[PDB]
């Protein structure tokens, strides 16, 4: 009898952007500077005991 | 009998203005900014899990 928008079945408006929870970043990259390295295992020299 | 003012049934004086207990306003209208919208349901996109 009466015309209602349920008869039209209109699609939703889509809103730009994405909503996200934030992620914790590296602590080691902040606390320790990167040294320049060549590909492969490194070796470092340490004193075990003084005289 | 002595003439008392009860005999005249005098009308009360009617004082200007109305007295009200206040009502709290919307908190959602203050804490969330309104976005512009067209009529009907809207759809928003969310990240459920990161890689």
Asked if A17 lies within 8 A of B43 by C-beta distance, the reply is no
Distance CA A22, CA A19 (A): 10
Asked if A14 lies within 8 A of B43 by C-beta distance, the reply is yes
Distance CA A17, CA A25 (A): 22
**Å between B25 CA and nearest CA of chain A:** 28
SS3 B11: coil
Nearest to A13 among B38, B46, B50 (CB): B38
**PDB resolution in Å:** 2.7
Show Cβ contacts of residue A23 under 8 Å, excluding neighbours closer than 6 positions.
B50
- Chain B residues whose beta carbon lies within 8 Å of the beta carbon of residue A20: 46-47
Please name the method used to determine this structure: cryo-EM
Distance CA A8, CA B41 (A): 14
């Amino acid at each position: 009898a009466v015309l209602k928008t349920s008869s039209f079945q209109l699609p939703r408006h889509l809103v730009p952007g994405v909503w996200q929870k934030a992620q914790g970043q590296s602590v080691l990259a902040r606390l320790s500077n990167a040294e320049p390295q060549e590909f492969g295992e490194q070796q470092y020299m340490t004193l075990t005991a003084p005289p």
